[PDB]
Amino acid sequence: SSRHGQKGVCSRKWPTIDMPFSETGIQPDIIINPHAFPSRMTIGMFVESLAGKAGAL
Amino acid sequence: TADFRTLERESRFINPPKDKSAFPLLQEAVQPHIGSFNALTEGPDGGLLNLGVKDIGEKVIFDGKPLNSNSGYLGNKLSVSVEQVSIAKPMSNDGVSSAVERKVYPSESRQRLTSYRGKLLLKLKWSVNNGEENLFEVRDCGGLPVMLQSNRCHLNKMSPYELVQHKEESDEIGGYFIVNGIEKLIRMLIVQRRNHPMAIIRPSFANRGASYSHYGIQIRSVRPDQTSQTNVLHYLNDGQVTFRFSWRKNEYLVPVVMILKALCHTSDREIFDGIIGNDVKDSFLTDRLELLLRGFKKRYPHLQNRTQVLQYLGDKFRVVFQASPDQSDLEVGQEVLDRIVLVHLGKDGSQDKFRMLLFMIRKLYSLVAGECSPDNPDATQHQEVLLGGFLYGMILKEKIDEYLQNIIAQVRMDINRGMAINFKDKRYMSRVLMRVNENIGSKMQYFLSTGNLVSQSGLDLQQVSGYTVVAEKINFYRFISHFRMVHRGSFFAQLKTTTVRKLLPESWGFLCPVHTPDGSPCGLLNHFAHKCRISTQQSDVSRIPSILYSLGVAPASHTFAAGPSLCCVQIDGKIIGWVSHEQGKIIADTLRYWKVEGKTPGLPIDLEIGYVPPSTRGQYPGLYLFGGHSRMLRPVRYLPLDKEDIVGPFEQVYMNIAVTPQEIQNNVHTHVEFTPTNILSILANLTPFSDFNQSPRNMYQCQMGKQTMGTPGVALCHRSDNKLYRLQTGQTPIVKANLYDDYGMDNFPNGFNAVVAVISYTGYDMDDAMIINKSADERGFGYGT
Amino acid sequence: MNRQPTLHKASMMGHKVRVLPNEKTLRLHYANTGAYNADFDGDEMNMHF
Amino acid sequence: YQRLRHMVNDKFQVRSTGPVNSLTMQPVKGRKRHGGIRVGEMERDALIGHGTSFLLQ
Amino acid sequence: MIVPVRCFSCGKVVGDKWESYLNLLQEDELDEGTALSRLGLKRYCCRRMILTHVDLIEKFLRYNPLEKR
Amino acid sequence: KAQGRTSGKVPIPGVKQALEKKEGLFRKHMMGKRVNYAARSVISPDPNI
Amino acid sequence: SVVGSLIFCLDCGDLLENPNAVLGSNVECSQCKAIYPKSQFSNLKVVTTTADDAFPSSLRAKK
Amino acid sequence: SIPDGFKKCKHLKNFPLNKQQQVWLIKFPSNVDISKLKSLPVTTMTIDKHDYKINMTLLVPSESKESLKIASTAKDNAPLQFDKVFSVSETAKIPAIDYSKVRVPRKDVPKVEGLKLEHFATGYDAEDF
Amino acid sequence: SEIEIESVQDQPSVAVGSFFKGFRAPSDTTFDLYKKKKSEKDEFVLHGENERLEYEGYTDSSSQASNQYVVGLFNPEKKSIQLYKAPVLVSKVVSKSSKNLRGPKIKS
Amino acid sequence: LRLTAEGNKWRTDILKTSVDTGREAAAEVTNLDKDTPADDPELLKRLQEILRDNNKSGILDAVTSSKVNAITSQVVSKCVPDGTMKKFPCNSMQAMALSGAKGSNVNVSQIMCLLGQQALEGRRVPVMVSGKTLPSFKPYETDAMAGGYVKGRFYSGIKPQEYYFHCMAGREGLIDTAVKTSRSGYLQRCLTKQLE
Amino acid sequence: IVMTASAAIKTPQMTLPIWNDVSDEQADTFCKSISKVLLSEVIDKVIVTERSYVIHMRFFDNNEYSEEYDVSKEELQNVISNQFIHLLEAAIVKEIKKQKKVQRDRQSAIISHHRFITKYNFDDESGKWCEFKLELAADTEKLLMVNIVEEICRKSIIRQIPHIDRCVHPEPENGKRVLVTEGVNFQAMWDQEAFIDVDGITSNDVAAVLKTYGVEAARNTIVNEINNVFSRYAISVSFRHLDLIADMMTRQGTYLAFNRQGMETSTSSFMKMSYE
RNA sequence: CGCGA
Ligand SMILES: [Mg+2]
C-alpha cells in the first residue's frame, strides 16, 4: 500500500528489462494501474508522486 | 517545509539523550494511561487507593459471648478495616533468606515470559470493641502487575540513554502491562459525563413498569475514589417520581420524596418552594408536584421524622447492605444515603445533595414539560473517557472490599463452627488470615489476562469484559494506536442501531474523524485527536465559589429559586447558586477570561466552563464547571488575548471557534484552533495530503498503516515477543508531515520510497494491481522478516 | 472455483486447469472477476477438484 | 510505500486428508495442522443452481 | 536498517557513499542537494537511496549482548 | 428444560443443543461440510491464460 | 401556606389534606399540630391550560 | 443548646427601626471594606478603585439585647419584611478582541529558493547549461 | 444617584434568616444568637424558641467566606442610610412534640 | 486533472452565485421574505424552532439540498469537458469515465469541479443542539457551506470544515457496506431452503 | 413481502385511479372528505379550571376546519356529545380506583347521559369553542386532567374511514391520474366509484387483496410490488423468477411466507428439520 | 468478537 490507502496485491515480479524505462534510464520500482483512481478518488497520491520526485531531485 | 535533520537524526541514534526524550509529544500521547495509573498512589490526598480503601471502612462481626449479665449484649465487637495501601516496585528476592533484593527491569519480565509485577501491601487495622483493642498488621496480597513507565516502574524517570542501558527501546513509552510476557493494556472507554445531570429519554424506561414514562434524569455520580454510582429518576405517568439506583448488580426503587426528607430535615413547603421558586404562576408543575407530595403522604403516614424515614430505609436495606446487627435502621439508613445518593457530594453533601436532587426534579419536570431538549448520551457533549488506571484501581478496591468480606466469612464460619475464638488473640488473628486466602495480585493479574471484570457490583459498567487488549507491536503505529484508542464498549457493538457509530460534530478536535477501523468496529473504536488530553487528576475548586460568590452568584444556601428561567451555577455537580442568564453569560465569559489570564489564583486553565445559554426547548440552561478527572480537554487559542486555552467537549458546543485565523469573524469567534491538524489522529496527520484523498480512502490508510510490516522496535534481541514482523530496510518518507518528526516516527521507519509509474503496461495489474520490478526486488527492496 | 460468499451459481464455476510454474497463487483471467466479484485485493477463492 | 502483513505464505492450504474429525469423519480448518475447506449452504445452493450437480453432490 | 548497497531502480551501487555523505553534511555543511550531486548521484532513483535513508542499525548496535554495559 | 446450576457456569450443551442452534449440526456438518481435494489460496490476475 | 390547591401549616410545613375531609371545622397540622379553621377560603380556583406542544392542526401547522 | 466555640451574644447593638425610613438588604463581596464607604447609586459604580454593579426574614435585638426579636413594623406583629434588595457584586472588564492583529491574511507555501537544474540529458553535466 | 453612608456597625445588631414564605412565629418567640470567632470567619448559630415549636438556624460556612451582607436603615428624606452588617441564617422549624417522634430499631 | 484557466474562472464564478443560496431556502422554508437578512431574529427564531423539530428540519435540508445541487450541475455542465485542460481522448481521466472503463462522470466532477452537498441519511450535516453544524460556524447558520455543501474539489483540496463533513459521508458509506453484507445474505437462505 | 409475509405492513396504500371527469379540485375535496379527522386536529387550545372543574376548548374558526377538514359543527357537537365523554369518564374512574335554551335541552340530555357532567355548553353559532363543567367527590385526588384530555382529544375521532387514514393526491404520473390511499379499505372505496375507478384499485397490501380479490389478484399484486423494489433501484429481474416465487407463496391458495411458518405445511421433514 | 473481499 501507499500512504493514500491504495492497497494491492503484488501481481508479478516483473523482469526489469520488460519494465518500461525512463528517458533517464530508471525503471520504476512499482507499477500501479492508472485506472485504479477515479473510482478511489485519491488525488494525494498523484500529488505525492510529484513532491516525492520533486524532493528527491 | 520540514527537513530530514539527518545529522540531528544520527547524532541521536549514536548518542541517545542522557537527560530526557527528544520527542515529548510522543510521551504526552500516552499520558492518559500513566497519568491515571500514577494517580492511584499520588495526589496530595494520598492517592486514589488510600482514598478508595478509606471508603470501604470497617467490617463488623460479633463473637456472641453472653458475658453473663434475653440480655442485649452481643459479645465482643470485631472491627475489620484496612488503613493505607502501598505498592512496592517490582523486586526480585533471591529464593528464601531475604537476601538483599534486586530491582526487576521489564526486559527481564518479557524474556522470562512472566508478569512484571510489584508487590501489593496493606496496612490492616484489626480492631476489637470499637477501638478498645486494635491491631495494625501489614499484609501482602500478592504481586501486582505494574504499568511500565509509571511511578512504580523502575524504568521511570530514566533518561533515554539509561533505558538503552537497561535494554528498553530508547524512546520506550511504557503505559502498559506485562502479563505472562504478554503486553496487555486497559483500553479506555467512554462513560457518561460525571457530576452532570442528564435528561434522558429512553423507551427502556417505560418498559420497566406500567406507569413509567420514557423520560428520565440520569446522573452518573462518582466518588473521589473513582467508584461510580448511578442514580436515575424515572418520571411515572401518574405523576410519581421513582428514584432508581443499583446495588450488588440489583436495581432498587424509592419514592423520591422519601429521600428528600431522608437527606435533610425539611418542611414540605420548603421542598415545593425549593423547586418552583418564583414559578408559582405555573399550574403544570404544581399539578405535577402536589400529586408527588400528596403521593408520599397517605402512602406513608407512619413516618413523621427524618429519623423515622432513615429507620424505615434501614429497615428495608439492612438486609441488602449486610448491616452489622448493632447498627440501627436509623444508623443504616444514614449509610444508605451516604453510600448511594449523589455520592460525589460526599457524606457531608447532605445539605447539598438535597439541593442537587431538587434541581433534577426541577429539570425532570421541565423535560417532561418539554421545555428543555433531551440529552444525547451518544453525544460527546455528555461523555467522558474512563481511564485505564482509574478502572484498574476500581477493580482493586473491589477485590480489597471482597477481601474483607472473605475475612469476616472466615470468622463467622469459625464462629458457627463453635470453635474457641478470641478476637484480642493475635495468634488467632493470624490463624484466621493464614486460613484466609489473600492473593489479590493474582486476581488482578487474572483480570489483565482475561479482561473479565469480576465484581459484586458492575462498577456501573454495562459490559462485563473486553477491558484488556493485547498491545500489538506489529508496526510502531499499531502499537501507539492502542493508547489513543477508545470506544463505547462491546455492549453498544451488538446494538442494531447504528446511530451510536455516527460522526457527531461534537467530536471536533477530540475524537479524530478520520481514524477508525472499518467493518463491525467502525464507528466504535475511535482515536483522540492527537492534541486531545485527558484530565488525569482533580483541579482545585477551593476558591472557585469565592470567585463565583464575588461575581454575583446568589448562594444556593439561601435565596430559594430554580428552573431554567434563570441560570444555575454548578461545580462538578455541586450547585453553587443561581443567576440570571444574562449575568451568567457575562460571568462565564469573564471567568473564561481570567482562566486564561491566569493571574487570578485558584483558577486552573484545565477547568471546563460549561455555560449553556437559555434557548427555546434547547438543552437545559445553566453554567457548569467540570474540573474533575477524566475530561477530554483539548487546547485552543483564545482571541481576546493571544494564549492557549483549554476546551472540553461539553463547553465546545456553544463556543464559536474559528478554524483558521482567516476565518475569524467580528463578534463571532472567541477562539481559534491553533492548527486545523489538531483535530486529527497521529496516523491521520501522517497521511500525506490527506485532504486531497477521498475520506473513506484515508480511513483505510489509518487501518492499513496499523497493519504494515514496520520496524516494531530496536529491542528485538532482548524482546521475547511471540510473533514479530520487521521490515529490513525502512526509509524516511520524502513526503512528510511535520508531526512525523515531532512524534519522531523516524525511530520506526514504516516503509520505503519507491519509484512509481502510474501506467497501464503489463496488464497483470488490473484488479488489485501491483507490479514490482523484479530486479528492484532482488536488490533487497521491501525485504521483510 | 469458488469465491465466498457465493451469492449466485455463477460465483462458482468450473475452470480448465493450466499449471503455472513459479508462483504460489491461484491466478485468473479477468473475464471471471465480474462473475466471482473479485477485486484482487487480498481476495481468496476456494478451488475444488 | 508500505509492505503489509497478510503475505500469501500465511494464507493458503490444500487437500486435507489428515484431520478427519472423529465425530463426523470429516476434515477440519486448514490453519497449520492440515485441515481443508468448508463448503456450506450458499455454496451448496449454487451447485444445485450452478448446474454442476452430479459433480457438486 | 543499514545503507542499501545498490539503488533499487538504477542498480547503481549506492552502498559506500553514505559515510562520505554524512561527512559532507557534517564537515562541509552542504545542503542535502549538492552533497548528493557532489557524490555523483544524478538519477533521483539513486538519490532517494541515500537521501531518504535511515541508519537504524545504529540504534541496534546500542544493544550488545556480548559486552558489559 | 434443565434447572439452573448455580445460576451461571453456563449449561453443558445437551443433545438437543448439538443439533439446533445456529447450526447446530444439520447446518454445520450436513448442509455444508469441510471437504477433500480442495485448496484455498489468493487469486492473482493473469491475462495470458 | 395555601397556594394552588396546596395547603401548608405556617408552623410546620406540612401539606394539608382535604379541608372538607375533616369532620370538625378546624384544620390541624399533622407535624406542628397547628390548628386552622376548616374554611378560611372557598376551594381555590386552579386554572390549568393545555400546552401547545400537543395536537397537529391546520392553523398551528400554518401559524 | 450551644455547640462548641459559640459564645452567645451578650449585648446586642442598637437597631434604630421605626414617608418613613427605608430598609435595604444589600450583598457585598467580603473582600470589600464596608467600614470605609461613602456614596452609592440607584446599575453600576466603583469601589476601592475597582468597579462594581448592582423570601427572608429580619430579626431585631431584644430589649435585653442578649437575644433576637422578629422584625415587625405593622404593630400588628405581622412580620416586617425587606423593603428593597440591592445586590452589590463584583463586575469585571474584558479585553476587546483586536481583529487586525489576530486575523492574518494567509501566507502561501514558501517557495524553496535556489533550485537549479538537477536534471540533465544523458552525457552532460551541470556546467554545460 | 448617590447615597450617603452614615454608619457601619461591625458588631452584631440585627440578623437575616430564611424559613419559607408565610413563616410566622408568635410575638413572644425570641432567638438565641450564638457566636464563634473562627479564624476571621464569624459563624452565627441561631436557636429560636417558643412553646410547642423549635426554630433552629445557622449561618452557612461556605457562603460567608466571600459573601458579605449589610442591611441598612435608609432615610429617603435624606440621601443617607445606616448600614449594619448582619448574617444570613439558614433556618428550619421543628415542633417539640413532633421532634422526638421515633420508631424502634427493628420491626418484628 | 486540471481545468483550463478559463474553466476555473467559470468554476469560481458559478460558485460565487451559491453564496446566498443557503439563506434563500431558509426564507422560503420559514415562509419569510426571500430578502430576509441572515441575522433576522424572526428568521433565527424559526430556524431555532425548525431545529427543535426533526420533521421540519428534514424539510429544510431537502429544499436546500435541491438548490445547491442545481448549482453543482451548472458547474459540471459548464466546466467539464469544456474547461478541462487536456481534452478527451488525450485526457485520460475523462477517457476512463467516458468509456466506462472505470469511474463515472460523478468522480471526474468531484475531482475537477467540487464535491457538493454531503448527503447524510438523505439529509445534510447533523446539527449540534446549539444550532451549530460545527464549532466553527455561527449558530443557526444560513450558509450552505456550513450545512455540508462542499465547494472544494479534490484536485484543489477541501477546507477542514468540508473535510470533517466529508469524513461523515465516508463513515456513512462504510457502515452501510458492512450492514448490507449480513442482511441480504440471511434473506436468500430463506428462499433457497424452501425453493430447493 | 417475502420472509415475514406480514398481513399488517408499515405503509398500506390504496392506488385509486380516478376517471377523467372529476377535476383536480374535485379529487382534492374527495380526498379530504374521505380522509382522517381527529378532534385534536381542530382544537386550538383547552383550559381546565378546578369538588369540580370546567373544560374550555378553543377551536379554530368554524369556517376554517369545516372548510379545511369539512366538519359540521353539529357532528362535531355530536362527536363531543356522546362518544367523547364516554371515553373521557372511562379512564377517570379507572384511574381513581387504580389509586387504591336550545342548549338547555341538549345540555339536559347530555347531563342525563353521564354521571360527571353537571353542566355543558357549546358554541352553537361561531362554533369557536366548546365549554363544559365536570364535578367529582368533595374528596378526590388532584389527578391530571389536561393529560387525560390531551390523550382523549388525539384518540377522539371526528371523521375517519376505517383503516384508511389520510390520502395524498400525488402527481398524475406517467399520464396516470391517481389518488394514493393510506391504509386499505376496498369496500369503502366501492361506494366512492362515483369518482374513482374501483376496477383499477390496487393496493400495497397483499393479504388485504387476498382477502378481498382473492389469491390471483394477490399474486399479481406481489409480482407488481416486488418489481417496484428492484424498479426503484433500477435493477432488473425477469418476471419468470417473480412468477415462480409468487406462484409458490400462493400454492396453498393463501399467502404463505418463506419463513418457518409457511414452511410448516411442507411434506419433507429434513428441509424443515434443518431450516430453523 | 479480534484479522481478509
Ligand atoms: Mg475485493
Side-chain angles (χ1 to χ4, degrees), chain C residues 2 4 9 12-13 24 44, chain D residues 9 11 39 43 49-50:
Chain C
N2 181 348
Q4 295 179 337
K9 63 179 184 68
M12 175 180 281
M13 292 175 180
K24 293 186 183 298
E44 288 187 351
Chain D
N9 294 335
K11 296 155 60 180
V39 177
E43 301 79 355
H50 218 326

Side-chain angles (χ1 to χ4, degrees), chain B residues 404-419:
Chain B
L404 302 182
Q405 296 301 321
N406 187 29
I407 288 171
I408 303 302
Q410 179 66 260
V411 175
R412 178 168 294 103
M413 176 180 72
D414 191 7
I415 290 173
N416 296 339
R417 185 182 296 276
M419 180 172 175

Side-chain angles (χ1 to χ4, degrees), chain C residues 3 37-41 43:
Chain C
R3 179 183 182 277
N37 189 340
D39 295 347
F40 294 110
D41 54 350
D43 291 339

